[PDB]
Every structure is written in C-alpha cells, then in structure tokens.
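Researcher: I've been going back and forth with a colleague about how peroxidase C1A might be arranged in three dimensions. Neither of us has a model we trust, so I'd like an independent prediction. The organism is Armoracia rusticana, in case that matters for your notes. Sequence below.
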Amino acid sequence: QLTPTFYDNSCPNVSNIVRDTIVNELRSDPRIAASILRLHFHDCFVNGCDASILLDNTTSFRTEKDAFGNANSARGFPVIDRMKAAVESACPRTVSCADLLTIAAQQSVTLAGGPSWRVPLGRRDSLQAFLDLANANLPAPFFTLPQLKDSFRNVGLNRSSDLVALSGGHTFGKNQCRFIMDRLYNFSNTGLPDPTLNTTYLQTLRGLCPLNGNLSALVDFDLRTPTIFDNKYYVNLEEQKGLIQSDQELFSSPNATDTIPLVRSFANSTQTFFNAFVEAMDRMGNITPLTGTQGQIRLNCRVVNS
Ligand code: HEM
Ligand SMILES: [Ca+2]
Ligand SMILES: [Ca+2]
Ligand SMILES: [O]
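Model: Here is an independent structure prediction for peroxidase C1A. You can compare it with whatever you and your colleague have in mind.
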C-alpha cells in the first residue's frame, strides 16, 4: 500500500526540490504547472502511474510520446529530467520517476493556487512503455459522456465524481484550435456549431480559431482564470462556456443526470471542489502501481536501468 511518508527518512527534501524546480520554470514558462499535471494524468491512465510515459523509443517498444493523445501535445519532459537529476543528487537511487511525477503534479496544482496535500508514495517505475495502450486508453475531446465514463471506468475510476473533479484540471492550461474546430463550424456533420456552446463565446472562439486557420494555435481552457487553479472551470460549464466537447458534456449531455449536480456543487464551493479534487487525484494516483520490489527506481526517467 502507498503511503505519504515513504520518503520522510530516505529523502525528506524531495517535495521541496520538486517545488523549487517548478517555481523556477514557471518564470519562463507559465504553462508548465498545467503541463506537468497533465503528464501525471496521461501516466496513470496507461498501465497505472508507473512513469511509462516518460520512456523514450527503443528498438523493442515504441514510446507513448507518439500516441495520438501525447504527440505534439504532451510537454514538460525536460523539466521532469531537471528535477529528477536534482533529486538524484540529494538522494541517489531513491525516488522513482513515477513518484517524482506524482509529487510534481501535486506541487504544480498547489503552486497554481490549488489545494495542498501529501500524496501517497511508494510507486516504482515500469520496465517498458505502452503506445498501443495509450492510444486505446487516453480519452479524446470528441468523446460523448458515455465514452468519457467508459474511459475512466476502464482504468479503475468508476465514480462520476472522479470524472467531474479530475476534469477540473482544465481550470488552467492550453488547448489547440484543432480540438474545437468541429464545435465552431461543423459539429456532428451538421454544418452548424455545437448548440451547447454559448453563442457569445462562440464568436470569441471563432476569432481565435478561424476556419482554415492555424490549427495549432493555443486557447485557454478557462476564460475566467487561465492560469489559476480554482473552481471557475465549473462556473464556465454552467454558462455553456466549457471549451471542449468533453468539458461541456459534463453539464449538457443527455446522460449528465449524475454529473450535473457535481458540476453545480463544485461551482458553488471552492472547498467542495478542492476536497473532491484531492480525493479523485489520490484515487487516480492509486491506479495499478508497481510497489515493493516490482519494477525499479529509474535513474534516468527516459530509459530503463541497465
Ligand atoms: C476527461 C477527459 C479529458 C479529455 C478528453 C481531455 C482533453 C484535453 C485536450 C484535448 C487538451 C489539449 C491538448 C493540446 O491542445 O495539446 C488537454 C489539455 C490539458 N488537460 Fe485534459 N483532458 C481530459 C482530462 C484531464 C484530466 C483528468 C486532467 C488532469 C487532472 C487534465 C489536465 C489537462 C491540462 C492541465 C491541460 C493543459 C496542458 C498544457 O497546457 O500543457 N485533463 N486535455
Ligand atoms: Ca503509465
Ligand atoms: Ca482557472
Ligand atoms: O488532458
């Protein structure tokens, strides 16, 4: 079983080293906290939080970095290498990349103004990467609510609160125009925009993402507080201002009878949201971890030890 005190004897300063790395990076890249939280999410949804996503290509297995959900999207890998090297200096061969990324995700959330808590630790690193599994397990913005629920249940998160709270990760960070083009000009082959997108916001988004424009252009997930981790993401949904299809469906899907009350609850209280976010985050961080003597303590997060 994972425990928050796992490194209190072997590397008590690990959390501080991680925080310092992120604080420093945030000065030149204000998007890094959001990027790191997402890396942890994409790690945990593929064979569990085993740092499998950090592995680079080898002649025997392909990297998850080339998965449809990661390619030209996932970022911050060099920052993880930086904190890993710093931790290896402070405490040689002690902290696993999987745990390091979990702490990095929590510290990123806290630094962005979110809740502060000690994550369970003791995870170990995978001996391989899973590209096919990443392609099958990572959800997509065009997923219907039933599909989003299926995706979460598939990795072990049965609760709608898991889905609604964790989707709160979109309270900050960026999104490429490519992922909302259908919502803006031709949703579900209607030649019309997604009716669940507020018409005033629709005009704003069309200006940021014109037809035939730069699909890689970046837009903020949260129009209220783009870089602050707070419950504004849910207030947006209530006003039909969720950015991507998967965001708005939590409030507008015909299958949202169970998610709507959660959306409202989180929009109404920061405390209720933060509590639910920590609860869901720890549940996600508990997905099929390698523990004890299973796996290894990777020295270089990009490659398996040899
Ligand atoms: C529920 C299904 C989800 C879907 C379909 C989804 C989809 C997306 C998409 C399309 C992007 C934009 C990627 C790009 O433009 O390159 C993105 C970004 C992001 N997502 Fe998710 N996401 C989901 C869940 C989550 C969860 C569970 C978290 C974390 C708890 C999360 C955190 C983030 C963050 C912070 C960003 C911004 C990353 C950055 O700016 O570098 N997402 N997501
Ligand atoms: Ca993984
Ligand atoms: Ca926000
Ligand atoms: O994501």
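Researcher: What would you highlight for our discussion?
Model: I'd start with this: Residues 31, 34-35, 37-38, 41, 73, 75, 139-141, 143, 148, 166-167, 169-170, 172-176, 179, 244, 246 surround protoporphyrin IX containing FE (ligand 1) (CB under 6 Å). After that, consider the following. Residues 2-138+285-305 form a domain with the Peroxidase; domain 1 fold (CATH 1.10.520.10).
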